[PDB]
Coordinates of C-alpha atoms in Angstrom, one line a residue:
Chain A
X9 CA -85.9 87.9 97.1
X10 CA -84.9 90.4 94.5
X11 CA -86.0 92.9 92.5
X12 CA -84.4 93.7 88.8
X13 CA -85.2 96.6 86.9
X14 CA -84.3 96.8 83.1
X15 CA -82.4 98.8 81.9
X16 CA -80.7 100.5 84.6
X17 CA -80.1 103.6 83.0
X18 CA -81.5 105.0 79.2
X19 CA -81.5 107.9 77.5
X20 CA -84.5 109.0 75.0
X21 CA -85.3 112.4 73.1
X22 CA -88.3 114.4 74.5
X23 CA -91.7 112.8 72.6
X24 CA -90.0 109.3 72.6
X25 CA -92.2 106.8 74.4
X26 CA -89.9 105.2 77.3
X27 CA -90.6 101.7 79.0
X28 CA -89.1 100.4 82.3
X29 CA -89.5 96.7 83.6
X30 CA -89.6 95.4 86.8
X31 CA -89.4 92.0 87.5
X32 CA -89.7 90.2 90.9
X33 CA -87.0 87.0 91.7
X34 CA -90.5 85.2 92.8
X35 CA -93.6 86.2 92.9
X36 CA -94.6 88.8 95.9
X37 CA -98.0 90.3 94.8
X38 CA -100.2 91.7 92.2
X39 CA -99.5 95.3 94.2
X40 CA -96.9 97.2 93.1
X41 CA -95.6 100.9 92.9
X42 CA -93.8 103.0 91.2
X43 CA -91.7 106.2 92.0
X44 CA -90.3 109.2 90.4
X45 CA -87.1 110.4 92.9
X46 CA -85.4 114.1 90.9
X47 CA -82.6 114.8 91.8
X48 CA -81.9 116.2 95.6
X49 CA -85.5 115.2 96.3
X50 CA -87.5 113.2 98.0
X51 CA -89.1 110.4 96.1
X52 CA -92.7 110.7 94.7
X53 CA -95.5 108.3 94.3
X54 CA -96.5 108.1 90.6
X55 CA -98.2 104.5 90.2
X56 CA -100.2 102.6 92.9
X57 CA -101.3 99.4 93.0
X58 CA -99.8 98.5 89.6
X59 CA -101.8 100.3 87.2
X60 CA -103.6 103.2 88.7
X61 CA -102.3 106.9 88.2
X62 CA -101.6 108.6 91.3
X63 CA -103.7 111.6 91.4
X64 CA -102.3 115.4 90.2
X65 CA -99.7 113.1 87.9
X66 CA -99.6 113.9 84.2
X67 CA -101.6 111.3 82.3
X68 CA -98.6 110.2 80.1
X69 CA -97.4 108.8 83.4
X70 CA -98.7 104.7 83.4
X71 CA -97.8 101.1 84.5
X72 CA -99.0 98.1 83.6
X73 CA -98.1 93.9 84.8
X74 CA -98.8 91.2 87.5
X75 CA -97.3 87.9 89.0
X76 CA -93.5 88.8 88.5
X77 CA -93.5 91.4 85.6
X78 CA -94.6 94.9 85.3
X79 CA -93.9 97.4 83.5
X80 CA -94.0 101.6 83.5
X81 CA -94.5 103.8 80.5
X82 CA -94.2 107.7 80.1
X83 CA -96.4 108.1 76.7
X84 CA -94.4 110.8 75.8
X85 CA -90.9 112.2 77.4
X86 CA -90.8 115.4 78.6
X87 CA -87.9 117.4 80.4
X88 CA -88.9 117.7 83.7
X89 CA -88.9 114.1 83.6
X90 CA -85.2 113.5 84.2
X91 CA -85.1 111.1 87.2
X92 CA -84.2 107.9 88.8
X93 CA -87.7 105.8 88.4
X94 CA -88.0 102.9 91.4
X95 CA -90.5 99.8 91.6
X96 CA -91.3 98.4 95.0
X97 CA -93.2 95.9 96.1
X98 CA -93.5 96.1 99.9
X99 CA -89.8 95.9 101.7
X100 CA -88.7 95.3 98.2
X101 CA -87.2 97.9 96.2
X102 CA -86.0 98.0 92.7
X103 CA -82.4 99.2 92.3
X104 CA -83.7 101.9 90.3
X105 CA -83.9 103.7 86.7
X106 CA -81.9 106.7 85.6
X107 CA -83.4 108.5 82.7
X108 CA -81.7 111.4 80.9
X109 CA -82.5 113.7 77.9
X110 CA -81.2 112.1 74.6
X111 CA -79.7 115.4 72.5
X112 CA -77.2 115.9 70.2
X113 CA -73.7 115.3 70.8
X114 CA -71.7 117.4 72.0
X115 CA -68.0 117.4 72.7
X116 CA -66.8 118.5 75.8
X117 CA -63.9 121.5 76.0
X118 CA -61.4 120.2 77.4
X119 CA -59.5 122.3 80.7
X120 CA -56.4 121.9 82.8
X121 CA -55.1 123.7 86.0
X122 CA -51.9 123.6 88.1
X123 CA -51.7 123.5 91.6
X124 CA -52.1 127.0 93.4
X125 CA -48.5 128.3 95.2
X126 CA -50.7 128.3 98.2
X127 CA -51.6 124.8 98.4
X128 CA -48.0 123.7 97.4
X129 CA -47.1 125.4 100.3
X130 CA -49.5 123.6 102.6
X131 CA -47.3 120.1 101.1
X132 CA -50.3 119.3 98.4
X133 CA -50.8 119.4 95.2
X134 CA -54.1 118.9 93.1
X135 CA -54.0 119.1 89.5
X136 CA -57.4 119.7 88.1
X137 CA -59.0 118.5 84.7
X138 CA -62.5 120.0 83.4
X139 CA -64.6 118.9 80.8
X140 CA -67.2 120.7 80.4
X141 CA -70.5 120.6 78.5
X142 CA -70.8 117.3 76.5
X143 CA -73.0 115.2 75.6
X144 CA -73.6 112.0 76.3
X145 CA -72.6 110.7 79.3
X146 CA -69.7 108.6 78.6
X147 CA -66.5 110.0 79.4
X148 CA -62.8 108.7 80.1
X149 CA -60.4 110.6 81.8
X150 CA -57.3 109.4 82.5
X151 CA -53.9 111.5 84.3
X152 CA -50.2 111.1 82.8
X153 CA -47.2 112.1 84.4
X154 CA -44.5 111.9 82.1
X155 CA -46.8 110.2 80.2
X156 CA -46.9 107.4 82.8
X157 CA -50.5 106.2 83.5
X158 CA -51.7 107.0 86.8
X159 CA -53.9 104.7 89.3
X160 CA -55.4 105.0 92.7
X161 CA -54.4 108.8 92.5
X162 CA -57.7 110.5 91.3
X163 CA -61.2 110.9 91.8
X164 CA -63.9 112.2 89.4
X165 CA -67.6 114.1 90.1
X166 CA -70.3 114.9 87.1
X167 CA -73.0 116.8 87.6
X168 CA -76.4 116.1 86.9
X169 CA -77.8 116.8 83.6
X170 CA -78.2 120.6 82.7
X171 CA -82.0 121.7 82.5
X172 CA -81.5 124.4 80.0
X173 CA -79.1 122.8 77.5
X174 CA -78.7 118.5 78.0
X175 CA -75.2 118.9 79.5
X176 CA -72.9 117.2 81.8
X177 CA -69.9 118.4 83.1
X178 CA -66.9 116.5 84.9
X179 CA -63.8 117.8 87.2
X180 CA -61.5 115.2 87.7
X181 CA -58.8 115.9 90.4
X182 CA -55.3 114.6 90.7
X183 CA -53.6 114.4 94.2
X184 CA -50.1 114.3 95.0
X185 CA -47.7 115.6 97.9
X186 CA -45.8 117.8 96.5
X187 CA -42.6 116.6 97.0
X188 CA -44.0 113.5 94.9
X189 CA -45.1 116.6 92.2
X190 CA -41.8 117.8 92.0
X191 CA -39.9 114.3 90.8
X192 CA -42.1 114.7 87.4
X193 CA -42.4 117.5 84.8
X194 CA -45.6 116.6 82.4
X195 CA -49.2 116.6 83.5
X196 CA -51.3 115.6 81.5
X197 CA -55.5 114.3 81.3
X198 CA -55.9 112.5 78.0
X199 CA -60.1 112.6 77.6
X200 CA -62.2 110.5 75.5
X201 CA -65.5 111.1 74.0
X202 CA -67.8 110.1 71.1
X203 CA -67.8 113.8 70.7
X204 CA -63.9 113.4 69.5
X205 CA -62.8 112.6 66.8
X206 CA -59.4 111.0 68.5
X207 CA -58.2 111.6 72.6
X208 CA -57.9 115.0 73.5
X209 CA -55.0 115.5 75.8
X210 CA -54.4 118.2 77.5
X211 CA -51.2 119.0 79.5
X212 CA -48.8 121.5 81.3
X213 CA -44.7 121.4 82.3
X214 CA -44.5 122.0 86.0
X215 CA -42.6 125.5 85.9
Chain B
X1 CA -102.0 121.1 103.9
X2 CA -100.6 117.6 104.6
X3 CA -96.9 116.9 105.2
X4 CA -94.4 114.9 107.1
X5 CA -91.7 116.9 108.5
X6 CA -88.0 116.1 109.6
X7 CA -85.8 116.6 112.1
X8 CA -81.9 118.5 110.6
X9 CA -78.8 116.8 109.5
X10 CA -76.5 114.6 111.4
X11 CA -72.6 113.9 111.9
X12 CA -71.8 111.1 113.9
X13 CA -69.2 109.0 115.2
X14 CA -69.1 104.9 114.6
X15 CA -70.6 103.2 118.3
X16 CA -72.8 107.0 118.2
X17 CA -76.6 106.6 118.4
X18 CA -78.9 109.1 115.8
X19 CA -82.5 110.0 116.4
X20 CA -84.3 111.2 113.7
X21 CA -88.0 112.8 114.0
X22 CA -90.5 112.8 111.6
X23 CA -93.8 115.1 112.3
X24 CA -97.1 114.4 110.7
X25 CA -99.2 117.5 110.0
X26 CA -103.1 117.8 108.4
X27 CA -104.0 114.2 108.7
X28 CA -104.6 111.7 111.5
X29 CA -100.8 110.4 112.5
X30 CA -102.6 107.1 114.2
X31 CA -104.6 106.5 110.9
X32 CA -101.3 105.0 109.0
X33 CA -98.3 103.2 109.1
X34 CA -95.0 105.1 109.4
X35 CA -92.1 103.7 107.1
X36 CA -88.4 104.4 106.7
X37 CA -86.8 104.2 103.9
X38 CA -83.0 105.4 103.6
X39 CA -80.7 106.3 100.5
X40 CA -76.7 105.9 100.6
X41 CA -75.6 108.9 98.5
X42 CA -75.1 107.7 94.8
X43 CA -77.3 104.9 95.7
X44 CA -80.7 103.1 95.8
X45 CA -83.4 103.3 98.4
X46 CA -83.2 100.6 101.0
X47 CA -86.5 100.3 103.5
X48 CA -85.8 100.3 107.2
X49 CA -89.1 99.2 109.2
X50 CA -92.2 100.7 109.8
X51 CA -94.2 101.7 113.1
X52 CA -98.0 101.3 113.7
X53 CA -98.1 104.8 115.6
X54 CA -101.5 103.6 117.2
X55 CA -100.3 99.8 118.9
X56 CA -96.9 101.2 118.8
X57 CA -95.8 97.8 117.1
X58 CA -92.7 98.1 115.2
X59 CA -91.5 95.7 112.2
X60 CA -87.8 96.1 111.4
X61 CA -85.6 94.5 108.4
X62 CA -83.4 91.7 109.9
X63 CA -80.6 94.2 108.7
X64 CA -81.2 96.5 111.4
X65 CA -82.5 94.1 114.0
X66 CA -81.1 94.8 117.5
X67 CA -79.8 98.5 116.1
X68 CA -83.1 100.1 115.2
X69 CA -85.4 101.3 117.7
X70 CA -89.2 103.1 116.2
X71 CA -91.1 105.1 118.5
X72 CA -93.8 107.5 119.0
X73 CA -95.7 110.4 120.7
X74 CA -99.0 110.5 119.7
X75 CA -99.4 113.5 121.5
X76 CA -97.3 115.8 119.3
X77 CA -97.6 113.0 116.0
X78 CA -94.3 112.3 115.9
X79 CA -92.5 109.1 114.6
X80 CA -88.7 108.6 115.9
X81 CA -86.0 106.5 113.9
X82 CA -83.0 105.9 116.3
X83 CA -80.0 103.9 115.0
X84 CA -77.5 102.9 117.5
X85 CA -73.7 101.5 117.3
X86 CA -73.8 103.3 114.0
X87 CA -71.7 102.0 111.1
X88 CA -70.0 104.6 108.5
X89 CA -71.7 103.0 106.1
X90 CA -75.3 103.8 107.4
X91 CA -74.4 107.5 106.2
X92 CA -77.3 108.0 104.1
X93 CA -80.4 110.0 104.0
X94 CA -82.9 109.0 106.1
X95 CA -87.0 109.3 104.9
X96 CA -90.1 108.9 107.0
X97 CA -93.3 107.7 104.7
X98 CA -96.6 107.0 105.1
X99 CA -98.4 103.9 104.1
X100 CA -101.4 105.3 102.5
X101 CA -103.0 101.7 102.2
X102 CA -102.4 97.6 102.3
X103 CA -100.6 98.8 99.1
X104 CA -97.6 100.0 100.6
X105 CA -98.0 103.1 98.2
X106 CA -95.3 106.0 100.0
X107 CA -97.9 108.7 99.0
X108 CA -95.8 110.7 101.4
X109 CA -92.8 111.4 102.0
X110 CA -90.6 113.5 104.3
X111 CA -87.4 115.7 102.7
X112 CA -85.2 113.6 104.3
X113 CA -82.7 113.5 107.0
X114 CA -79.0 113.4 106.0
X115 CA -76.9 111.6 108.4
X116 CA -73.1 111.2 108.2
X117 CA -71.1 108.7 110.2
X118 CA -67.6 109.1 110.2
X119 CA -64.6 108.7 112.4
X120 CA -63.6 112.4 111.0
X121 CA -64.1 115.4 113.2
X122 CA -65.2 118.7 112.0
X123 CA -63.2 120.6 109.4
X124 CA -63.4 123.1 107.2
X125 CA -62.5 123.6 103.9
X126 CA -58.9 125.2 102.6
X127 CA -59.9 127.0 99.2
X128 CA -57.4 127.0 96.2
X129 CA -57.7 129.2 93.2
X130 CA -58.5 127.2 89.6
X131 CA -56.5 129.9 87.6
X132 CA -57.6 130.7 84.2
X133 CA -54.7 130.7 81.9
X134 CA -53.7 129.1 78.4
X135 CA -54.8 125.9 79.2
X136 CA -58.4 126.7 80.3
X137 CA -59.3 129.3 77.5
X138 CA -61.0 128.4 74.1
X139 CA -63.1 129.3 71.9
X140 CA -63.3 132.8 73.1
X141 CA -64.5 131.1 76.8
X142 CA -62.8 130.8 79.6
X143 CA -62.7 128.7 82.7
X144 CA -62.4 129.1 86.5
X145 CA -62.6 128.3 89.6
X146 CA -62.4 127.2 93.3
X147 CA -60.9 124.0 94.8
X148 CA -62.9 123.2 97.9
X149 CA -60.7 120.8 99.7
X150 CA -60.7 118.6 102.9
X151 CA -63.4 119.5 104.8
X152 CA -66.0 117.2 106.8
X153 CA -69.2 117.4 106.6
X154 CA -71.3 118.2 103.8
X155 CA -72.3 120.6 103.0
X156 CA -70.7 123.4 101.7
X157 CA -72.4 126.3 100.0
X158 CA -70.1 128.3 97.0
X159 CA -70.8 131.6 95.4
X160 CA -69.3 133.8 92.8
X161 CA -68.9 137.5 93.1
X162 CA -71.8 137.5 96.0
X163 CA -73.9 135.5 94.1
X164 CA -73.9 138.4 91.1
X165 CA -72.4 135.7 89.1
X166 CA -74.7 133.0 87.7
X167 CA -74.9 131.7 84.3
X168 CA -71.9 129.1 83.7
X169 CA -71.5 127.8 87.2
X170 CA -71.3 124.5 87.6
X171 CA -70.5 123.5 91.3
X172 CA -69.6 119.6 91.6
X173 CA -71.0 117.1 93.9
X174 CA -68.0 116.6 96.6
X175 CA -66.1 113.3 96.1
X176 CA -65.0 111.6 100.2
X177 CA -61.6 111.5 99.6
X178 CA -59.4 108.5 100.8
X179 CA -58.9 110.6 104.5
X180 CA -62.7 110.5 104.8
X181 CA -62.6 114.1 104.3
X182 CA -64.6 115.9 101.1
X183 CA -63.2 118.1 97.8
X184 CA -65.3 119.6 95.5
X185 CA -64.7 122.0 92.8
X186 CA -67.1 125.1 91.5
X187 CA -65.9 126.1 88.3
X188 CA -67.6 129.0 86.4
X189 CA -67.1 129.3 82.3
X190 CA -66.8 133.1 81.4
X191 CA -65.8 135.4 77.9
X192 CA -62.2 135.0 78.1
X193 CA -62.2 139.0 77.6
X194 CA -63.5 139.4 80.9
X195 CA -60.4 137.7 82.3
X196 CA -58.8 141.4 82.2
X197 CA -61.8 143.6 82.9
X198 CA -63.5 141.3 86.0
X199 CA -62.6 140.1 89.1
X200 CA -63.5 136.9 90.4
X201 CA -64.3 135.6 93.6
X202 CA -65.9 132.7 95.2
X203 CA -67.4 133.0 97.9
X204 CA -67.1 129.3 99.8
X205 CA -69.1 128.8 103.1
X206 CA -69.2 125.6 105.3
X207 CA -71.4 125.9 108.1
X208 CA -70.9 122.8 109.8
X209 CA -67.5 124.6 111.0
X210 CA -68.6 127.9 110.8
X211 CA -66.0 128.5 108.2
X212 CA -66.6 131.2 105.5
X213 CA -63.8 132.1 103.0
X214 CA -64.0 134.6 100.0
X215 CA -61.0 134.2 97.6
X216 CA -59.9 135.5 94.9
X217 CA -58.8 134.3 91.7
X218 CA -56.4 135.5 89.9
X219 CA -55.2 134.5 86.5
X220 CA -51.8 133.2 85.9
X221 CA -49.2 135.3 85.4

């Protein structure tokens, strides 16, 4: 038995009215119940029993379905609302809902930094890329060395969606010994956005 | 008023056992069904079993059959979650809930119980400058920052100039690193002027290892 929530992520400017389905593999039962988890928190109980409004939750909060198909509905987004939204029906848990604040987009600034002398020293050596501030989520960094691709070399982290301003940001770190840094002399992170108008690369010469 | 509250976080070896508490306060603990439900980070919530704190019946998901064990002391209204021959992939945070009817509707929930599993041992973090320069300046803004690197476990706290410092910090969520060990990065956006006027610091502090560094970063010269 599963459970399949549509979609599994959407963005929507505060006022919009947002709608998430849930849909059972086979039916289960007329009871089901929605949460609200934010992030580094517990989740919350917003819906019970399909339809009913848990109490202290803001009235634009509401659900609606039965057999296989149910559906939840905030009236009218706010900003607080920025959450994964899950529908469960007893051991069954949907695979969840991310909602962000639809805003304007916003084109990230683009930053690079070489390794530190002391971590070359330690036989390392992490190049860092930072784009910061953009809007929306979507975002494509990719490392060149000598303008040669790179591949299993990198990991990438984005932070959750800025309260006062819509934001993301994203550090993307490449990892190297450093005798492996020392064979090549251009780094470069090429980034793409729908905030650019074309890739943004930007790049250093080792020494 | 009415709460369920947990036991701290966990590091564990695979083959290592965990036992987590959860302690009902302001309502009657033999009145409801205990759940747990558990989260993988970056991931969805996955329900473990529940425990009838007044028969002391337990009902598990086949997944953790034979490796789950739910108990309780009704004397101190406390429901225990303890995973045994733990996997490195049951690091995840673990939640105690109560049923508040024949719904299952989680009207409450615990804060959660992070548990890591990892061959790794302890280790804290070596801090690298992010040095503002050329490349991280625009626009009359620059960046900078701290490179948290290879430490184990989460979490690690970072400040900047004692915690003076707070508009334009963004620390990152960690990424496990192909050694099973974490890297993050706190960055902090400032007025490129202040590049020759300020000092910055940031102030890194891992207390799984008791490991607190303070450095300094300079821009490049």
């Amino acid at each position: 038995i599963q459970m399949t929530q549509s979609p599994s992520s959407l963005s929507a400017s505060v006022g919009d009215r947002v709608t998430i389905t849930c849909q059972a593999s086979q039916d289960i039962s007329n009871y089901l119940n929605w949460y609200q988890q934010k992030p580094g928190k517990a989740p919350k109980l917003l819906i019970y029993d399909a339809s009913n409004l848990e109490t202290g939750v803001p009235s634009r909060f509401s659900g609606s379905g039965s057999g296989t198909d149910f559906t939840f509905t905030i009236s009218s987004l706010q900003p607080e609302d920025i959450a994964t939204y899950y529908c469960q029906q007893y051991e069954f848990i949907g695979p969840g809902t991310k909602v962000d604040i639809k805003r304007t987009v916003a084109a990230p600034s683009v930053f690079i930094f070489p390794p530190s002398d002391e971590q070359l020293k330690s036989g390392t050596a992490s190049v860092v890329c930072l784009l910061n501030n953009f809007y929306p989520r979507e975002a494509k960094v990719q490392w060149k060395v000598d303008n040669a691709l790179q591949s299993g070399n990198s990991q990438e982290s984005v932070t959750e969606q800025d309260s006062k301003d819509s934001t993301y940001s994203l550090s993307s770190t490449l990892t190297l010994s450093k005798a492996d840094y020392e064979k090549h002399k251009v780094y470069a992170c090429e980034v793409t956005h729908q905030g650019l108008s074309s890739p943004v690369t930007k790049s250093f010469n080792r020494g | 008023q009415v709460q369920l509250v947990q036991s701290g976080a966990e590091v564990k070896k695979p083959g290592a056992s965990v036992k987590v508490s959860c302690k009902a306060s302001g309502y009657t603990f033999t009145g409801y069904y205990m759940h747990w439900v558990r989260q993988a980070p970056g991931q969805g919530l996955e329900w473990m079993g529940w425990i009838n704190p007044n028969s002391g019946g337990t009902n598990y998901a086949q997944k953790f059959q034979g490796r789950v064990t739910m108990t309780r002391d009704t004397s101190i209204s406390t429901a225990y979650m303890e995973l045994s021959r733990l996997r490195s992939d049951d690091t995840a945070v673990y939640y105690c809930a109560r049923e508040r009817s024949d719904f299952w509707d989680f009207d409450l929930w615990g804060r959660g119980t992070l548990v890591t599993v990892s061959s790794a041992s302890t280790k804290g973090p070596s801090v690298f400058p992010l040095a503002p320069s050329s490349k991280s300046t625009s626009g009359g803004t620059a960046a900078l920052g701290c490179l948290v690197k290879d430490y184990f476990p989460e979490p690690v706290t970072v400040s900047w100039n004692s915690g003076a410092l707070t508009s334009g910090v963004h620390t990152f969520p960690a990424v496990l690193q192909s050694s099973g060990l974490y890297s993050l990065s706190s960055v902090v956006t400032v007025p490129s002027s202040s590049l020759g006027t300020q000092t910055y610091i940031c102030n890194v502090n891992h207390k799984p290892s008791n490991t607190k560094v303070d450095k300094r970063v300079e821009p490049k010269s």
